[PDB]
């Protein structure tokens, strides 16, 4: 009769593989075509995308 000991929670919303909703205007931009230099922006990320 009692519910299981670990308290259950509910996540409500849309199921998406790798969606990133928080999008703003970043001042620093890397090369448009070379996606091997975009990790330099993960290193110093924009303030809003520090922990998306």
């Amino acid at each position: 009769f009692p519910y299981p000991n670990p308290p259950l929670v509910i996540c409500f919303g849309a199921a998406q593989k790798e969606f990133v909703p928080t999008v703003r205007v970043s001042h620093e931009q890397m090369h448009q075509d070379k996606y091997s230099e975009w990790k330099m922006l993960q290193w110093n990320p924009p303030e809003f995308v520090r922990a998306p």
């Binding site: 091997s36 230099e37 990790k39 330099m40």
Partner: protein, 58 residues
Amino acid sequence: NEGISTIPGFNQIQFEGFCRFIDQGLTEELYKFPKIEDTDQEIEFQLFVETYQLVEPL
């Protein structure tokens, strides 16, 4: 511009060295060549350094 976000090419050193050579060293050496004038009339031959063009291998 390259090699700052990934491991650079192992053969990039020789590549850029040969590129800089072909770019500037040939012209720098051709500039310092002297004007051949060894005669009393002083018949002088010259090499137009500006017209330097390499050709593809046969």
